[PDB]
Design a binder for this molecule. Structure first.
Ligand code: AKG
Ligand code: HMU
Ligand code: NI
Length: 333
């Protein structure tokens, strides 16, 4: 019913008014839920507008994130990312080093490699046994950092549950089917800062990007982006298409676990972040926030009802959600 957020090269990413799922009469609620599902089943991406998270709070959260990344290099490494099983803390991709152990076939590539021009900080739920968040010190500009981000984590946690309900309603299964699979909130709030960079850097280092192509791992990802642009989604014809920023929208995409969970009725689509499409000498800083939603780590993941007719259509063996994720997170090391 809304004009598509993206409509190019066979890639159609719908723009959906989420308040119509939450506040509509039964007919409108079903129409919206079906629009949401259909978006996931085709593009694997949707844009939501009029979500319960408020614009001025989102802007406060973006300012708060920007204050963290202005912190000195040493203060950010203090709260550094440790292990894949914690998946919490600060990181910036380093350049790989040639060493005595390295194979000479790889040396030409290692020297030419260009790491993503980004830095990140990841926050998990506060009360996970054995995995506390490495919070920075609450002083000067970072007073309120914790309470703000925990607040935002819980609002995104609520939105996750609501988007899965829309998926359930659109599938015509029990509206609350996913609740017990996602109620723990084993999610990851990834704050991202892509620093100001000269456009010539992308010519000097050919193949250089802001974020490498990938699929996300979990159920869904709530992606809040600023107005800079650069996010691209891969079309059915194999081309990366610009996911244009639209004010007060959240870009929502399915991850590999939901794809598998859905018996591949829902798509998990390749995406990346390159230079903004506009031509300029210097690209200003880009801020985004990726809230990775996952099934409960304890959840066992096998085909959702109504995603297959005969058992022979089930493409995948059952897996534990938690184990799967750590394998994805630990693979690159
Ligand atoms: O920054 C963005 O717009 C996308 C980042 C992303 O896809 C990710 O962190 O997984
Ligand atoms: O926890 C994470 N980290 C990174 C990704 C992909 O960028 C993901 O999907 N989930
Ligand atoms: Ni991603």
């Amino acid at each position: 019913m809304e004009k598509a957020a993206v409509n190019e090269d066979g890639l159609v990413i719908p723009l959906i008014d989420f308040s119509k799922f939450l506040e509509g009469d039964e007919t409108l609620k079903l129409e919206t839920a079906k629009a949401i599902l259909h978006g996931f089943q085709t593009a694997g991406f949707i844009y939501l507008k009029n979500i319960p998270i408020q614009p001025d709070f989102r802007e406060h959260v973006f300012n708060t994130s920007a204050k963290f990344f202005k912190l000195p290099k040493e203060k950010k490494l203090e709260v550094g990312w440790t292990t894949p099983e914690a998946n919490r803390g600060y990181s910036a991709p380093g350049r790989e080093k040639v060493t005595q152990l390295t194979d000479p076939a790889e040396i030409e590539k290692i020297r030419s490699a260009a790491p993503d021009i980004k830095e990140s900080y990841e926050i998990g739920r506060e009360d996970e046994p054995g995995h506390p968040n490495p919070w920075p010190a609450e002083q000067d500009d970072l007073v309120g950092f914790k309470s703000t981000m925990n607040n935002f984590f819980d609002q995104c946690k609520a939105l996750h549950i609501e988007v899965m309900r829309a998926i359930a309603v659109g599938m015509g299964i029990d509206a609350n089917y996913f609740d017990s699979f996602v109620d723990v909130g084993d999610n990851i709030l990834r704050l991202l800062h892509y620093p100001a960079v000269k456009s010539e850097v992308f010519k000097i280092n050919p193949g250089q990007v802001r974020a490498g192509e990938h699929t996300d791992y979990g159920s869904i990802t709530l992606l809040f982006q600023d107005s800079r642009g650069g996010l691209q989604v891969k079309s059915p014809n194999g081309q990366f298409i610009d996911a244009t920023p639209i004010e007060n929208t959240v870009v929502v995409n399915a991850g590999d676990l939901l794809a598998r969970w859905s018996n591949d009725t829902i798509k998990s689509t390749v995406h990346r972040v390159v230079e903004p499409p506009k031509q300029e000498d210097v690209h200003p800083p880009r801020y985004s926030i990726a809230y990775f939603c996952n099934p409960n780590h304890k959840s066992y993941i096998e085909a959702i009802p109504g995603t297959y007719a005969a058992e022979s259509e089930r493409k995948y063996e059952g897996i534990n959600s938690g184990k799967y994720l750590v394998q994805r997170l630990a693979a690159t090391y």
